Amino acid sequence: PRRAPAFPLSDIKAQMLFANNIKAQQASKRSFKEGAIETYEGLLSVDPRFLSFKNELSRYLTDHFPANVDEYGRVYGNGVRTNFFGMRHMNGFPMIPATWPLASNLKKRADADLADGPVSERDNLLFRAAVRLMFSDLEPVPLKIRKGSSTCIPYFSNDMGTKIEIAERALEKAEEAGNLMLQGKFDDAYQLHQMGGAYYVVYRAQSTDAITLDPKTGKFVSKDRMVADFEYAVTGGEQGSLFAASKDASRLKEQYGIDVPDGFFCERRRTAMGGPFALNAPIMAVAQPVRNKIYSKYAYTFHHTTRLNKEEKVKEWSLCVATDVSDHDTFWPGWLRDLICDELLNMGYAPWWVKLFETSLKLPVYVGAPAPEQGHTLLGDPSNPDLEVGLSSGQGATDLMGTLLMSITYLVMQLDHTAPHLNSRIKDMPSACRFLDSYWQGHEEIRQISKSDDAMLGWTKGRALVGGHRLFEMLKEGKVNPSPYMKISYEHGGAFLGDILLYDSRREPGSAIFVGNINSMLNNQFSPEYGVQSGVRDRSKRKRPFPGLAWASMKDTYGACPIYSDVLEAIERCWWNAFGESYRAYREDMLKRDTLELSRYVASMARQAGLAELTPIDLEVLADPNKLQYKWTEADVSANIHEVLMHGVSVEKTERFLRSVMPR
Ligand SMILES: Nc1nc2c(ncn2[C@@H]2O[C@H](COP(=O)(O)O[C@H]3[C@@H](O)[C@H](n4cnc5c(=O)[nH]c(N)nc54)O[C@@H]3COP(=O)(O)OP(=O)(O)OP(=O)(O)O)[C@@H](O)[C@H]2O)c(=O)[nH]1
Ligand SMILES: [Mg+2]
Numbered sequence: 001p002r003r004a005p006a007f008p009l010s011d012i013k014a015q016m017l018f019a020n021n022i023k024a025q026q027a028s029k030r031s032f033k034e035g036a037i038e039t040y041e042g043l044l045s046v047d048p049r050f051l052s053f054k055n056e057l058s059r060y061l062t063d064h065f066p067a068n069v070d071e072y073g074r075v076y077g078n079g080v081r082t083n084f085f086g087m088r089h090m091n092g093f094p095m096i097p098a099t100w101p102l103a104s105n106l107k108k109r110a111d112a113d114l115a116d117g118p119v120s121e122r123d124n125l126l127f128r129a130a131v132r133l134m135f136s137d138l139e140p141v142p143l144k145i146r147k148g149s150s151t152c153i154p155y156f157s158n159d160m161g162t163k164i165e166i167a168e169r170a171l172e173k174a175e176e177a178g179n180l181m182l183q184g185k186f187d188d189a190y191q192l193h194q195m196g197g198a199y200y201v202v203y204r205a206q207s208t209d210a211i212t213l214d215p216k217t218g219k220f221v222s223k224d225r226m227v228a229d230f231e232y233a234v235t236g237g238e239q240g241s242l243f244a245a246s247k248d249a250s251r252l253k254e255q256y257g258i259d260v261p262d263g264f265f266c267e268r269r270r271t272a273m274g275g276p277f278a279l280n281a282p283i284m285a286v287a288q289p290v291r292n293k294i295y296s297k298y299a300y301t302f303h304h305t306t307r308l309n310k311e312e313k314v315k316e317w318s319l320c321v322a323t324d325v326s327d328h329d330t331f332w333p334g335w336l337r338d339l340i341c342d343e344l345l346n347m348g349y350a351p352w353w354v355k356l357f358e359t360s361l362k363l364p365v366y367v368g369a370p371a372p373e374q375g376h377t378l379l380g381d382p383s384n385p386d387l388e389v390g391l392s393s394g395q396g397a398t399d400l401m402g403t404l405l406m407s408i409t410y411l412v413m414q415l416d417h418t419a420p421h422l423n424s425r426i427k428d429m430p431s432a433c434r435f436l437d438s439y440w441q442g443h444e445e446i447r448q449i450s451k452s453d454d455a456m457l458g459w460t461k462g463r464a465l466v467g468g469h470r471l472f473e474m475l476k477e478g479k480v481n482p483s484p485y486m487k488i489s490y491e492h493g494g495a496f497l498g499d500i501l502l503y504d505s506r507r508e509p510g511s512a513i514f515v516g517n518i519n520s521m522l523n524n525q526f527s528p529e530y531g532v533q534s535g536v537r538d539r540s541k542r543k544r545p546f547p548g549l550a551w552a553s554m555k556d557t558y559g560a561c562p563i564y565s566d567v568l569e570a571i572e573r574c575w576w577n578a579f580g581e582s583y584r585a586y587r588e589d590m591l592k593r594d595t596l597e598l599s600r601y602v603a604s605m606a607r608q609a610g611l612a613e614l615t616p617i618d619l620e621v622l623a624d625p626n627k628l629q630y631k632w633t634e635a636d637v638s639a640n641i642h643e644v645l646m647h648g649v650s651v652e653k654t655e656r657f658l659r660s661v662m663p664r
């Protein structure tokens with residue numbers, strides 16, 4: 001029932017997605033590639049000492065610090081959620097094949113029994129009220145662009161000057177492109193303004209993934225990751241198959257002569273979509289202002305920074321429920337995209353801009369190389385965007401889309417199972433708006449803190465509380481999905497935005513605290529997602545600009561973990577056995593070196609002034625700017641630092657553009 005149309009690279013529809021320049025042409029042909037990452041300068045991820053080290057350290061920590069998570073998924077004690085075997089992957093070598101992205105998720109949602117539109121008028125009112133509170137009184141800001149990022153689509157440029165140009169040109173022609181699309185002229189819009197085309201699909205690494213040790217066999221087992229072949233992806237799952245990707249690393253010996261120790265596997269690979277920059281710029285121009293609004297006015301449920309920032313809110317609750325959403329992005333509903341557009345039109349947003357936005361959520365995807373001998377296929381017709389991939393990762397507002405979907409979904413789950421007495425407060429748009437406004441500010445007896453699919457649901461004392469406990473119990477039994485919109489369950493080892501909520505014997509929000517996830521310290525130091533890219537001169541353009549700085553924020557980020565010291569000591573001891581050196585000393589040097597290299601990028605830094613002024617956040621971000629795209633926002637990072645990583649378009653250019661978009 002409607003297979004998505006598909007075109008090979010050689011087809012003209014695919015060829016037009018790539019400009020006549022070397023970069024674009026190469027991106028279109030890039031074949032499957034693998035190899036050890038350069039974990040740290042001079043250290044390959046498959047280095048025998050390094051794998052020996054990982055073998056001993058993971059076995060030791062698992063053995064001495066088994067998980068402390070109760071039947072309700074709350075973690076207590078040692079603050080450990082699971083074993084430490086996740087670090088056992090040959091980083092840089094992926095599971096084969098990666099998945100083909102689903103062209104349509106309608107069947108996937110229907111088969112999972114999720115609704116195909118708001119199920120009640122109340123719900124419809126709440127989603128629309130969310131659009132209203134989020135997109136209403138926006139203040140222009142400048143359009144910030146990540147240094148070294150690709151404009152993808154037709155040009156695949158990384159040059160800042162070229163990006164700035166593209167973005168400014170896009171803010172000037174967005175209106176005319178939008179109108180062309182309203183007339184059904186997508187090709188004209190793509191050809192004249194590069195707004196359209198496709199998302200460029202690239203596979204990324206989730207460096208660590210669950211592994212277990214079968215006490216029976218003494219053998220390790222990697223978690224199966226299901227992937228869809230092409231047939232399955234273009235037919236929405238109607239045909240083709242869904243199967244376990246192979247994580248088996250034996251092949252590395254045979255193929256590259258790399259020695260594979262027992263119990264080491266290939267990495268899990270996730271899909272990433274690079275959006276066509278001319279189309280995303282007009283969207284990012286509105287999206288940042290929305291973020292500024294929800295982070296300020298609705299800071300209670302949406303602005304999260306420190307462990308204490310979150311702790312303050314949750315400590316006042318009588319019950320805290322850590323939720324989990326299964327595969328959020330691919331389940332995200334296109335009907336919400338259409339509801340949001342509809343409400344934006346109602347609020348008075350420019351039609352051409354809503355059209356740009358709507359189209360960015362229906363765009364075809366160009367699949368590059370999921371496995372050797374596979375790929376180079378465009379899914380969907382750019383002449384008539386109509387894909388239902390769910391939520392595309394590089395769209396300019398994917399975080400807002402997930403947050404709008406989930407924040408309401410969690411509220412609905414609270415109303416449905418614990419606070420029916422609040423329904424009478426939601427009768428129409430005005431009252432829905434008032435109620436959501438109050439709820440989002442933490443003023444109701446039911447509350448939440450969330451960011452897209454990560455969240456914690458709260459109940460203060462009151463009528464809803466007894467329901468809250470029944471909901472939790474429903475989640476623990478896990479036989480009934482509590483939401484009609486997405487598959488929700490409880491997180492096993494509850495955490496929020498990286499911080500584990502540590503409970504004591506009371507097992508209550510009031511006497512619980514937020515600590516760092518010690519396992520993540522280990523993932524970040526021994527299993528980064530990218531190599532150090534030392535051949536890239538401009539450090540600011542690297543995926544990991546200054547790896548050494550994370551050493552200076554380690555105590556800050558993980559100090560509160562019950563087993564912090566023990567882990568540092570096991571590391572030191574295992575590093576000695578593997579490398580005959582002190583790990584601490586190795587890091588202190590890397591920390592000194594990167595501190596000096598940093599002063600060359602920061603103006604306000606003397607050619608050796610210390611890290612004195614920088615916050616823990618600043619450092620974690622300089623060592624891994626990726627956290628700026630899922631954990632923190634420009635606002636949480638010092639300004640002299642933010643300029644190392646980003647550049648912007650003038651406020652006057654975006655101000656004039658915002659004005660033409662908004663109602664008032
Ligand atoms: N580890 C991980 N998880 C990732 C992921 N992309 C998407 N997920 C999904 O997030 C949840 C929770 O996973 P968990 O390992 O329990 O905790 C993660 C997660 O909450 C968060 N996080 C890391 N990377 C991302 C990301 O790109 N997007 C989102 N939305 N959330 C992310 O950080 C916690 C700690 O991660 P870790 O210590 O492994 O550090 P990484 O540097 O490896 O993260 P990365 O994004 O790769 O740079 C589950 O549904 C999971 O499927 C991902 O990449 N890694
Ligand atoms: Mg999960």
Ligand SMILES: [Mg+2]
Binds near residue numbers: 624626627
């Ligand atoms: Mg990361």
Ligand SMILES: [Mn+2]
Binds near residue numbers: 496
């Ligand atoms: Mn969580």
